Design a protein around this nucleic acid. Structure first.
Ligand SMILES: Nc1nc2c(ncn2[C@H]2C[C@H](O)[C@@H](COP(=O)(O)OP(=O)(O)OP(=O)(O)O)O2)c(=O)[nH]1
Ligand SMILES: [Ca+2]
Ligand SMILES: [Ca+2]
Ligand SMILES: [Ca+2]
Length: 341
DNA sequence: GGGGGAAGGATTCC
DNA sequence: CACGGAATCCTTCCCCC
């Protein structure tokens, strides 16, 4: 089995660049302005010119300007990036039917029944990078190996604008020398939990007693890490289907006042319903980011679809249920619709 | 003992 | 200061064969 993984470079910023080539070369930071104050917000992402100086995704815009006061700060435009992604995903289908669209900017292609080895795969990769650059003008990174996880790491290592082949031999080197925290799915919190067990490489998970591992990071993670370490991990390329759609917005100021929170919640419901596109959800969740940046939610599943009118009415009750069970002030509020009909 | 679902929380960035 | 979207997993609670 041969898996090919494509991941677009600094995608959002790169898109802003394609839509305005004069940006090429300058540091570009795509931002999400909350509207709390002049420059309040966070960095969506930034091109490498800016990333080399510490401006990455997540930090406050304000902190970005303290580092690169003269970089180009553009507001984030999801819709556009969304349509640019789609177009690219379509070129990929022109290489395989078995394709899993993992996110807005990466996909796994099953090319096992279309190539005979890795040198011929390395070739199909260069082919794809070129077809994407020529058509949409976007540079991507390609990762190639036996399963999805290893293909992603290959990419992770070749970024940016690269292509790497992690073959069966190297898979052996990696399971030994690979830093466990560099494995897709191991975040800082799962990364630290594994330290307390003295696990620094995939191989270490083999020598610890399952029930202990299983009781430190949960059954799923554990079996996942083990199969990888044992070289017997091999999940298939699945055609993913959206199971959720929603929107969360930030308010001008924290509050626990129902009437001054509703407007944000209703707008979230409107943009939400517009994106459903013919789809009818049976479950709705009201999500709230409290003041100490802690997330809370309250949902309801219906035996039928939810009309926009029932959405408005029901979300208000769930918000009320939130302000009643939680004493904290609310910073961000939104809605999420699921269990589509 | 345990299927199956729903709900609220936790974690990754896949 | 610290935005935003969505998948997957964990745990407790329920209902009940
Ligand atoms: N709003 C927001 N968007 C994010 C965040 N992180 C990632 N994104 C979006 C914008 C990125 O362009 C897009 C693709 O994410 P990637 O992890 O692949 O990062 P990117 O492609 O930007 O750089 P990369 O070449 O992969 O190192 O995901 C975030 O924290 N907030
Ligand atoms: Ca990317
Ligand atoms: Ca990506
Ligand atoms: Ca990591």
């Amino acid at each position: 089995m041969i898996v090919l993984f494509v991941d677009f470079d600094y995608f959002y910023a790169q898109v802003e660049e394609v839509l305005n080539p004069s940006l090429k070369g300058k540091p570009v930071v795509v931002c999400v302005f909350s509207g709390r104050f002049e420059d309040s917000g966070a960095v969506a992402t930034a091109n490498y010119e800016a990333r080399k100086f510490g401006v990455k995704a997540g930090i406050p815009i304000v902190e970005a300007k303290k580092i690169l006061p003269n970089a180009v700060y553009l507001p984030m435009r999801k819709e556009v990036y969304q349509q640019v992604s789609s177009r690219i995903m379509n070129l990929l289908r022109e290489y395989s039917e078995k394709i899993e669209i993992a996110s807005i900017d990466e996909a796994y292609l099953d090319i096992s029944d279309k190539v005979r080895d890795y040198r011929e795969a390395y070739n199909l990769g260069l082919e794809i990078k070129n077809k994407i650059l020529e058509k949409e003008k976007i540079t991507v990174t390609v990762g190639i190996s036996k399963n999805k996880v290893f293909a992603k790491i290959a990419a992770d290592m070749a970024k940016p604008n690269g292509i790497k082949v992690i073959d069966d031999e190297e898979v052996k080197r990696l399971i030994r020398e690979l830093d466990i925290a560099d494995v897709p799915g191991i975040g800082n919190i799962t990364a630290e939990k594994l330290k307390k067990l003295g696990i620094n490489k995939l191989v270490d998970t083999l020598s610890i007693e399952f029930d202990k591992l299983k009781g430190m990071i949960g059954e799923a993670k554990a079996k996942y890490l083990i199969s990888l370490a044992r070289d017997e991990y091999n999940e298939p390329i699945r055609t993913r289907v959206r199971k959720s759609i929603g929107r969360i917005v930030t308010m001008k100021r924290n509050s626990r006042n129902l009437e001054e929170i509703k407007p944000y919640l209703f707008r979230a419901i409107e943009e939400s319903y517009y994106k459903l596109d013919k789809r009818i959800p049976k479950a709705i969740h009201v999500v709230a980011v409290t003041e100490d940046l802690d997330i809370v939610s309250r949902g309801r599943t219906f035996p039928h679809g939810i009309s926009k009118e029932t959405a408005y009415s029901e979300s208000v009750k769930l918000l009320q249920k939130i302000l009643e069970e939680d004493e904290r002030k609310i910073r961000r509020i939104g809605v999420r619709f699921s269990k589509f009909i």
